């Protein structure tokens, strides 16, 4: 059985008010089919501007991060409550920039995800290995460890996992212009799906979306989208460009 | 010679869209004199809502945090460029919640501050010791170390320091309802001003604002404001309440 395809655009720390207005309008003007989930994640200060600019009935706005506590004395942090008050359904958790550059631990990412999921959000949960870890032949060990941390907070819970979208982004592919080959990406996605079937649920493994990120763009996404276990993309740099819309079209054509 | 008094309200991780609209309107309706700087720092997702609600010609909106890189691949982070594009002049850097709970290092806080100052922002730079550090009689050593980290990035630079407001908030006073006595606070502020005179500039020490935070509220702020070296307040919990306006009035009456 199959999955609703998913494409997310992570703007990261980019944008101005004028850009958000113009780019969100451009995406919203694209004919987005009802058969694919399309989500964009502007920087936190731009979320309300993006929501106001979003005239699409399909496009959804997401956050790039959320904290693991509710409202309270957490200077600089955003709560799930704040995001839901703004009408958001989606949030990115555990992006490799936060894990590897900003010191977000496996347990911290897992706790953020659990809190968001328990409150009814859809979490795009990111995992991935560094070039060093892949050279050491620890690719699956690393990715599985990141997921087992979420598993520790959610276990086998049903429908905690229902609204998880796993995003595999090899760290060596992020912003480097070095995309994983379809073979390399599919191999990891197969491994993640086997892990899910074994440690969570066999039926659940058939339904969970596992998307690929890391230098995914309009030129390479068709071949990735043709891989049985790659349900779509988490797009960084290309999400700031008109080619993001081309990717939506390619994903639709290849997987619906 | 003397200082323009400064009062900042840090909302921390609190608020909904409706609250921001209503509370910013309430503050903006207060008669704020031209003689005092009054700044409020909503959560990042609420900044644009607060800016739209702010009809005051005196009140300024500030951010609670900013990253130490420009725009780029920093998922979950906000750049100085983004804040300036939104028209903001002020940012809180090095809040003790970020230092002590979220692992922001002295050097990281210093680098954030330097970047913001170089771009023309006013930085509310927070320092403070824990109860453990004070028990160990290391209060001044800790606070000075946090400032020397900024000094390392700015040195004796003129007018890098011109737009710094130092905020002393003993960690044991944050959200605990245990305010420092005027005697305790003034003693630290004297120490910080002596440090500034010795390590930065004697004339500069006469002009830099050093504000107190940590359970400051409408009931205790007059006695603090009467201390020669306490130029105002960084207000947490009370900034979410109507008593914030009472504090503005008390600060004006005591220091102008």
CA B140 – CA B129 distance, rounded (Å): 8
How far apart CA B22 and CA B50 sit, in angstroms, is 10
CB B61 within 8 A of CB B39: yes
Please tell me the distance from the alpha carbon of residue B193 to that of residue B199, in angstroms, as a whole number: 10
In eight-state DSSP terms, residue B181 is P
Q: What's the full length of chain A, in residues?
A: 256
The 3-class SS string of chain A reads CCCCCEEEEECCECCCHHHHHHHHHHHHHCCCCCCCEEEEECCHHHHHHHHHHCCCCCCEEEECCCCCCCCECCCCCCCHHHHHHCCCCEEEECCHHHHHCCCCCHHHHHHHHHHHHHCCCEEEEEECCCHHHHHCCCHHHHHHHHHHHHHHHHCCCCCCHHHEEEEECCHHHCCCCCCCCHHHHHHHHHHHHHHHHHHCCHHHHCCCEEEEECCCCCCCHHHHHCCCCCCEEEECHHHHCCHHHHHHHHHHHHHC
Q: Which residues of B are annotated as a binding site for substrate?
A: 10, 12
Answer whether B75 sits within 8 Å of A85, measured CB to CB: no
- d(CA A5, CA A32) in angstroms, rounded, equals 12
Pairing of strands A164-168, A209-213: parallel
Tokens of A9: 């655009």
A154 backbone dihedrals φ, ψ, rounded to 5°:
-110, -10
Residue ranges of the binding site of B: 10, 12
Task: Tell whether A130 lies on the interface with B, counting CB pairs under 8 A.
Answer: no
Domain ranges, residue A220? 1-256
Is A225 in contact with A247 (CB distance < 8 Å)?
A: no
CATH number at residue B49: 3.20.20.70
Q: Chain A partners of B74 at a C-beta cutoff of 8 Å?
A: 12-13, 97, 101
H or E, element range at B225: helix B221-225
Task: Please answer whether residues B212 and B234 qualify as being in contact, where contact means their C-beta atoms are separated by less than 8 angstroms.
Answer: yes
Instruction: Report CB contact under 8 Å: A86, B17.
Output: yes
Q: Kindly state whether A175 is in contact with chain B, defined as any CB-CB distance less than 8 angstroms.
A: yes
Q: Which residues of A touch B82 (CB under 8 A)?
A: 13, 15-16, 43, 45-46
| A192 neighbors A145 (Cβ within 8 angstroms) | no
Report in angstroms the alpha-carbon separations of A38 from A1, A4, A117, A234.
21, 11, 19, 10
Question: Closest approach of chain A CAs to the CA of B102, in angstroms?
Answer: 9
Which of chain B's residues have a Cβ under 8 Å away from the Cβ of A103?
103
- Measure CA B41 to chain center: 9
A23, A90, A95, A189: the active-site residue: A95
A10 marked as part of a ligand binding site = yes
> Looking at A90, A169, A186, A189, which residue is catalytic?
A169
Mention every residue, 6+ apart, whose C-beta is less than 8 A from residue A183: none
Q: Is B10 on the interface with A (CB under 8 A)?
A: yes
Structure tokens at A2: 């199959």
Q: Mark B136-168 as b/e (b = at least 16 C-beta within 10 Å).
A: eeebbebbbebbebbbebbeeeeebbebbbbbb
Cα separation, A39 vs A210, in Å, equals 15
Total domain count, chain B:
1
B111 CB within 8 Å of a chain A CB: no
Burial of A101 (0-12, 13-18, 19+ CB in 10 A): middle
- Does the CB of A173 have a partner CB in chain B at under 8 Å? no
Indicate the SS3 state at residue B135.
helix
Angle between helices B243-255 and B17-29 (to 10 degrees): 30
Whole-number Å distance between alpha carbons of A167 and A122: 13
Instruction: Measure Cα distances from B21 to A135, B28, B37, B61 in Å.
Output: 53, 11, 21, 13
For A18, counting Cβ atoms within 10 Å of its Cβ (0-12 exposed, 13-18 middle, 19+ buried), the class is exposed
User: How many other β-carbons are positioned within 10 Å of the β-carbon of residue A227?
Assistant: 18
Could you confirm whether A207 is annotated as catalytic?
no
């Amino acid at each position: 059985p199959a999955r609703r395809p998913f494409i997310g655009g992570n703007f990261k720390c980019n944008g101005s008010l004028d850009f958000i207005k113009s780019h969100v309008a451009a995406i919203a003007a694209h004919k987005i089919p009802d058969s694919v989930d399309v989500v964009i994640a502007p920087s936190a200060v731009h979320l309300s501007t993006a929501i106001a600019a979003n005239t699409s009935k399909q496009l959804r706005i997401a956050a790039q991060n959320v904290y693991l506590e509710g409202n309270g004395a957490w200077t600089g942090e955003t709560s799930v409550e704040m995001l839901q008050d703004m009408g958001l359904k989606h949030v990115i958790v555990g992006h490799s920039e936060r894990r590897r550059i900003m010191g977000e631990t496996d347990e911290q990412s897992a706790k953020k995800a659990k809190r968001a999921l328990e409150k009814g959000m859809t979490v795009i949960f990111c995992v991935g290995e560094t070039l060093d870890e892949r050279k050491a032949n620890r690719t699956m060990e690393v990715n599985i460890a990141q997921l087992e941390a979420l598993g520790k907070e959610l276990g086998e819970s049903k429908m905690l996992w229902k609204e998880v979208v796993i995003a595999y982004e090899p760290v060596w592919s992020i912003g480097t212009g070095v995309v994983a080959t379809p073979e390399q990406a599919e191999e990891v996605h197969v491994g993640l799906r086997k892990w899910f079937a074994e440690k969570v649920a066999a039926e659940g493994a058939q339904h969970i979306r596992i998307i690929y990120g890391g230098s995914a763009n309009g030129s390479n996404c068709e071949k990735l989208g043709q891989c049985p276990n790659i349900d779509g993309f988490l797009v960084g740099g290309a999400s700031l460009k008109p080619e993001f819309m081309t990717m939506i079209d390619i994903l639709t054509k290849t997987r619906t």
